[PDB]
Design a protein around this ligand. Structure first.
Ligand SMILES: *[C@@H]1O[C@H](CO)[C@@H](O[C@@H]2O[C@H](CO)[C@@H](O)[C@H](O)[C@H]2NC(C)=O)[C@H](O)[C@H]1NC(C)=O
Lengths: 50, 50
C-alpha cells in the first residue's frame, strides 16, 4: 500500500518549564513579628535556614 | 465559702476588664498594642468594616 498524496499537519505540544519562585520568611508565618516566639524558635536551630 | 468566676476570653465585646489605664493611639507606626486584653504588635490604620 503506497501513498500518492500527503498532508502537512501542525500539532501543539505544551510543556511546563518553570514555577513561581516562592520564598518564605519563617518568623512571620510561624510567630508574626513576636520576639518571644522567635526566641523560643531559636531553640529549634537550623530548620528555617534549611 | 467558695466562688467560681466563669468567663470566656477574647471572643465577644468586653464590658468587664482589669484595672490597667488606657493610652493614646498612634497610627501608621508599628507599636505593641492591647485592645480589650487582645495584645499584639503591628501598625494600626483606619478601615471600613460593618
Ligand atoms: C493530492 O491531495 C491533495 C490534498 O491532500 C490535493 O489538494 C487538493 O486538490 C483538490 C483537487 O485538485 C483541490 O480542490 C483542493 O483545493 C486541493 N487542496 C488544497 C489545500 O488546495 C491534491 O490536488 C492531490 N493531488 C493529486 C495529484 O491528486
Amino acid at each position: 500500500a503506497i501513498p500518492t498524496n500527503f498532508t502537512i499537519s501542525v500539532t501543539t505540544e505544551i510543556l511546563p518549564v518553570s514555577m513561581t519562585k516562592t520564598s518564605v520568611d519563617c518568623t512571620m508565618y510561624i510567630c508574626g513579628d513576636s520576639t518571644e516566639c522567635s526566641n523560643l524558635l531559636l531553640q529549634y536551630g537550623s530548620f528555617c535556614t534549611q | 465559702r467558695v466562688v467560681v468566676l466563669s468567663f470566656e476570653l477574647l471572643h465577644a465585646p468586653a464590658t468587664v476588664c482589669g484595672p490597667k489605664k488606657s493610652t493614646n493611639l498612634v497610627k501608621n507606626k508599628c507599636v505593641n498594642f492591647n485592645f480589650n486584653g487582645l495584645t499584639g504588635t503591628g501598625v494600626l490604620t483606619e478601615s471600613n468594616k460593618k
